[PDB]
RNA sequence: GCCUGGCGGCCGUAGCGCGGUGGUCCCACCUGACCCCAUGCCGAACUCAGAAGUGAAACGCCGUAGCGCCGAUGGUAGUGUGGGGUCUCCCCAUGCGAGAGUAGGGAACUGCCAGGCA
RNA sequence: CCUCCUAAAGAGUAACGGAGGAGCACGAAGGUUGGCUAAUCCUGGUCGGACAUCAGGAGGUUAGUGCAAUGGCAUAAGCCA
RNA sequence: ACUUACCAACCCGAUGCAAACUGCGAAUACCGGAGAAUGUUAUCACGGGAGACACACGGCGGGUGCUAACGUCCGUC
């Protein structure tokens, strides 16, 4: 009565903290906002996070709910 | 407006003198009067709510708000969000004029009157009770009722204790039993 | 009233302590008050018997370490998982 | 509950300034008095400020707390920013409805050569 | 026979029985029966062993059972081809690691608890030992 | 399915049309919406909902 | 330099809890509501004019270890590499090493601006 | 086809392994602007019944998300205009 | 309206269990950066010629089965 599963969506982190990226490069594919867009980083309709500027990826935890935020500082 | 003035000149002073309160802004003051009509059986007869609403208007010109079922529950063969009651929030001039419409020209006219119970301050100074027959308000005549309909009244206060609720109303006479 | 003879530990971690128990000794520790913790090594057979009389867990014991004396009380104890022995004990300089 | 309701109502508009790097014009209103400041995108140093608690433009007001008073406060912040060099900002009404006094302060700021 | 009344799932990955036990001091009574060897207790074994101590003590003394089946064991019956799905639940076991207090007792003299818990050890599939309450 | 495809025709002669869906039971009237006609380059009114 | 309004930083050692507290200035309820605005009803809010009272509510500060929170040391469990026995498991060398608990710390620290008190 | 899982803490990973779902819905159940906050204990209250409705505090997203699971959600993605 | 050798949620302290529970949480492993040494350029691109898609065992991590199989299916050496 079983016998089913779903195809893997290849999510996870594509660019980690400390990596040079251009603008538009995808950094994380996600379902919810496990990670949030921080300063100079943008959010697409499926919560895919992408670079809005050339620079290096930076993971930090900020604010009162200890959420993970990803930003990009220009280099 | 008559009962807001009478509260200040005499009751403020008196209430200070029970527990010997230090500040005039600490004496509980009557804030608001809220009327509600629980219809409950409007789900079968949809018009019973319409006839309930107009009842409140003559008691308190203020057009009533209709309260929804919130939780669906088959335990009463009901829907959710379908109207099942109505409410009116009184403050300022009308609240004081409505309060008048209650003791002076209704209470002498209560059915089998010997006084009301005094144990029902839920524990924090707010008072709640009910009346069975709404023809006791004189804007409501007897020749104009399509129903033996009624309505609970609950008052809300700034007293912090049950003791501080009894002294505030006592100072407004209030029949008590 | 009980007096325990102890030597100071020269090593630390799982290897030495399993080696200690492999050498029929076992570690314990002294902490409390303003002074620093004191890593010690004890002879196994002596403390097993001592703590078999309730007096051990409620009296002030005396530890003799390098011929001095630290006054402590038993505070916590790790016992062997299923054998009648001891893995570690906490003493507090109370 | 009175004060806390307004602070939450304003937060969303403030995060956009954080994302955008915007310089915001922050208003605080009280029944007794109205206040206007100018804060940098970093949020912690005020480049310009002006209010009714200041003796200059405040005694010359009928009540330090009406639409005209708000209008007096509004007039002062726009120019003062000019006296330093700050000119394009965005208005952060800090959760008050944009309406009574709050609109007088904003209208006065625009009239006196401020782009927002 | 002890058994979970309900579980989220009928069937369970085999899993393992690594590591050491958490239930290692006598926490309710005065004396205890402790697991030494490692393994799985069926619900029928736990019941047979629980009976032995109750025969021996008459309707005296209180007994606590510290382990609980919780783990479902499946089997494929005879004459079945491999594959074609996981077996049907037949009985229930608890995973035991050395050191788990299995049974405790208090309300009899120590000498009788050792005898009473002992007339149980012959029912268990793992070696056991008698343990006592200990100060601290 | 149980939701029909319709065509929206530009009320400016152009032969541009949009395609969408509709619950024809629950929504029997003709759907009417402003859309951009790439030929007249303006947001003109669109009709039809068969 | 002490106090309060405003804007953030850090993001529970920053918080409840109970006891005390302050109103000249600020904040705060607050009084009137005909009009800018307003109640799926009500000047409660939204809020316009207002300053007679008021620290009572809350707001701000302080004391407070009943609760949360921070939580060593030493040990235990695991584990990557090598090898080893009783090879459903564990052990030895080696480096990394929990979690819970424990003695313990604990009633936040700040930059700015404005106003009020020396 | 989708979601979780075995999957050994990046991606992927197998079997007639373990549990569920999709073949639709929406003209607003879409954009935006303003604005809004659940579940459930205790007590009190007209017909109040364990649980229609008004009130008080305790409580703090267990509510909610057009439906399967997962991750999200308060600046709300939830609710209303 | 009462009692009650009955059953008994919530609530609290004690106590274990969970692949599809996590307010904690490694060891490895992967990404990225720079740097010395060593390395038959081991790297990347493009193009020419193929074979290959029946696998086995052992170690460990696992589902399955009986922690049964010279069983079986993956991950890895
Ligand atoms: Mg080792
Ligand atoms: Mg006070
Ligand atoms: Mg620790
Ligand atoms: Mg993975
Ligand atoms: Mg009730
Ligand atoms: Mg991996
Ligand atoms: Mg080559
Ligand atoms: Mg093939
Ligand atoms: Mg071949
Ligand atoms: Mg084979
Ligand atoms: Mg293979």
Curated annotation (Swiss-Prot), chain A:
It holds the Pfam family Ribosomal_L27. GO terms for biological process: assembly of large subunit precursor of preribosome; cytoplasmic translation; cytosolic ribosome assembly; positive regulation of ribosome biogenesis; regulation of cell growth; ribosomal large subunit assembly. The keyword Phosphoprotein does not apply. GO terms for molecular function: ribosome binding; rRNA binding; structural constituent of ribosome; tRNA binding. Keywords: Ribonucleoprotein, Ribosomal protein, RNA-binding, rRNA-binding, tRNA-binding. GO terms for cellular component: cytoplasm; cytosolic large ribosomal subunit. Belongs to the bacterial ribosomal protein bL27 family. Part of the 50S ribosomal subunit. Cross-links to the 23S rRNA. Cross-links to the A and P site tRNAs. This is Large ribosomal subunit protein bL27. It comes from Escherichia coli (strain K12).
Curated annotation (Swiss-Prot), chain B:
GO terms for molecular function: 5S rRNA binding; RNA binding; structural constituent of ribosome; tRNA binding. Belongs to the universal ribosomal protein uL5 family. It comes from Escherichia coli (strain K12). The keyword Cytoplasm does not apply. This is one of the proteins that bind and probably mediate the attachment of the 5S RNA into the large ribosomal subunit, where it forms part of the central protuberance. Its 5S rRNA binding is significantly enhanced in the presence of L18. In the 70S ribosome in the initiation state was modeled to contact protein S13 of the 30S subunit (bridge B1b), connecting the 2 subunits; the protein-protein contacts between S13 and L5 in B1b change in the model with bound EF-G implicating this bridge in subunit movement. In the two 3.5 A resolved ribosome structures the contacts between L5, S13 and S19 are different, confirming the dynamic nature of this interaction. Identified as a multicopy suppressor of the slow growth phenotype of an rsgA (yjeQ) deletion mutant. InterPro entries: Ribosomal_uL5, Ribosomal_uL5_bac-type, Ribosomal_uL5_C, Ribosomal_uL5_CS, Ribosomal_uL5_dom_sf, Ribosomal_uL5_N. One of its GO terms (cellular component) is cytoplasm. It comes from the Bacteria. This is Large ribosomal subunit protein uL5. One of its GO terms (biological process) is translation.
Curated annotation (Swiss-Prot), chain E:
It comes from the Bacteria. Keywords: Hydroxylation, Methylation, Ribonucleoprotein, Ribosomal protein, RNA-binding, rRNA-binding, tRNA-binding. The modification N-methylmethionine is found at residue 1. GO terms for cellular component: cytoplasm; cytosolic large ribosomal subunit. Is hydroxylated on Arg-81 by RoxA. The modification is nearly suppressed when E.coli is grown in anoxia. One of its GO terms (molecular function) is structural constituent of ribosome. GO terms for biological process: cytoplasmic translation; ribosomal large subunit assembly. The modification (3R)-3-hydroxyarginine is found at residue 81. Belongs to the universal ribosomal protein uL16 family. Part of the 50S ribosomal subunit. Cross-links to the A and P site tRNAs. Interacts with assembly factor DarP(YjgA). Binds directly to 23S ribosomal RNA and is located at the A site of the peptidyltransferase center. It contacts the A and P site tRNAs. One of the last ribosomal proteins to be assembled in the 50S subunit. The simultaneous presence of uL16 and bL36 probably triggers ObgE's GTPase activity and eventual dissociation from the mature 50S ribosmal subunit. It has an essential role in subunit assembly. This is Large ribosomal subunit protein uL16. It comes from Escherichia coli (strain K12).
UniProtKB/Swiss-Prot annotation, chain F:
Keywords: Methylation, Ribonucleoprotein, Ribosomal protein, RNA-binding, tRNA-binding. PROSITE patterns: RIBOSOMAL_L33. One of its GO terms (cellular component) is cytoplasm. Coiled coil: none annotated. Surface exposed on the 50S subunit. The keyword Acetylation does not apply. This is Large ribosomal subunit protein bL33. GO terms for molecular function: structural constituent of ribosome; tRNA binding. The gene is rpmG. InterPro entries: Ribosomal_bL33, Ribosomal_bL33_CS, Ribosomal_bL33_sf, Ribosomal_zn-bd. Part of the 50S ribosomal subunit. Cross-links to the P and E site tRNAs. Belongs to the bacterial ribosomal protein bL33 family. It comes from Escherichia coli (strain K12). One of its GO terms (biological process) is response to antibiotic.
């Amino acid at each position: 009565r079983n016998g089913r599963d779903s195809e893997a969506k290849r999510l996870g982190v594509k660019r980690f903290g400390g990596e040079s990226v251009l603008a538009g490069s995808i950094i994380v594919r996600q379902r919810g906002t496990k990670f949030h867009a921080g300063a100079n980083v943008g959010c697409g309709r499926d919560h895919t996070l992408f670079a809005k500027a050339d620079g290096k990826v930076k993971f930090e935890v900020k604010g009162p709910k200890n959420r993970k935020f990803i930003s990009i500082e220009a280099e | 407006a008559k009962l807001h003035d009478y509260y200040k000149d005499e009751v403020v002073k008196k209430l200070m003198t029970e527990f010997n309160y230090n500040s005039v802004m600490q004496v509980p003051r009557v804030e608001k009067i809220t009327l509600n009509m629980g219809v409950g059986e409007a789900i079968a007869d949809k018009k019973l709510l319409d006839n309930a609403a107009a009842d409140l208007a003559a008691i308190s010109g203020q057009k009533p708000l209709i309260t929804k079922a919130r939780k669906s529950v088959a335990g009463f063969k009901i829907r959710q969000g379908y109207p099942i009651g109505c409410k009116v929030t009184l403050r300022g001039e009308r609240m004081w004029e409505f309060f008048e419409r209650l003791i002076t020209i209704a209470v002498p006219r209560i059915r089998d009157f010997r006084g009301l119970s005094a144990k029902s301050f839920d524990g924090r100074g707010n008072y709640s009770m009910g009346v069975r027959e709404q023809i006791i308000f004189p804007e409501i005549d007897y020749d104009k009722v399509d129903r033996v309909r009624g309505l609970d009244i609950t008052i809300t206060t700034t007293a912090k204790s049950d003791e501080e609720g009894r002294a505030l109303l006592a100072a407004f006479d209030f029949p008590f039993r | 009233m009980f007096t325990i003879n102890a030597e100071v530990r020269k090593e630390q971690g799982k290897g030495a302590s399993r080696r200690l128990r492999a050498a029929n000794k076992f570690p314990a520790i002294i902490y409390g008050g303003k002074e620093a913790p004191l890593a010690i090594e004890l002879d196994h057979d002596k403390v097993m018997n001592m703590q078999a009389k309730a007096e051990f867990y409620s009296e002030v014991l005396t530890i003799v370490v390098d011929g001095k004396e630290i006054k402590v009380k038993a505070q916590d104890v790790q016992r062997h998982p299923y054998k009648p022995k001891l893995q570690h004990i906490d003493f507090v300089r109370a | 509950d009175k004060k806390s309701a307004r602070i939450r109502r304003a937060t969303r508009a403030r995060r956009k300034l954080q994302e955008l790097g915007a310089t915001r014009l922050v208003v605080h209103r009280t029944p007794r008095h109205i206040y206007a400041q100018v804060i940098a995108p970093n949020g912690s140093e005020v480049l310009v400020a002006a209010s009714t608690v200041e003796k200059a433009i405040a005694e010359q007001l009928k009540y330090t707390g009406n639409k005209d008073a708000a209008a007096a406060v509004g007039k002062a912040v726009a120019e003062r920013a000019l006296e330093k060099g700050i000119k394009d900002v965005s208005f952060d009404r800090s959760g008050f409805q944009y309406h009574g006094r709050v609109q007088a302060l904003a209208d006065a700021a625009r009239e006196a050569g401020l782009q927002f | 026979m002890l058994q979970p009344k309900r579980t989220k799932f009928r069937k369970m990955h085999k899993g393992r029985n690594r590591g050491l036990a958490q239930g290692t001091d006598v926490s309710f009574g005065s004396f205890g029966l402790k697991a030494v060897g490692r393994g799985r207790l069926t619900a029928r074994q736990i019941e047979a062993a629980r009976r032995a101590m109750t025969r021996a003590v008459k309707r005296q003394g209180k007994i606590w059972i510290r382990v609980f089946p919780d783990k479902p064991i499946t089997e494929k019956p005879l004459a079945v081809r491999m594959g074609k799905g996981k077996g049907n639940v037949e009985y229930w076991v608890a995973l035991i690691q050395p050191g788990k207090v299995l049974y405790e007792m208090d309300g009899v003299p120590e000498e009788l608890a050792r005898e009473a818990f002992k007339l149980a050890a012959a029912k268990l599939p793992i070696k056991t030992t008698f343990v006592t309450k200990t100060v601290m | 399915g149980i939701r029909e495809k319709i065509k929206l025709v530009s009320s400016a002669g152009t032969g541009h049309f949009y395609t969408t869906t509709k619950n024809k039971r629950t929504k029997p009237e003709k759907l009417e919406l402003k859309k951009f006609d790439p030929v007249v380059r303006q947001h003109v009114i669109y009709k039809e909902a068969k």
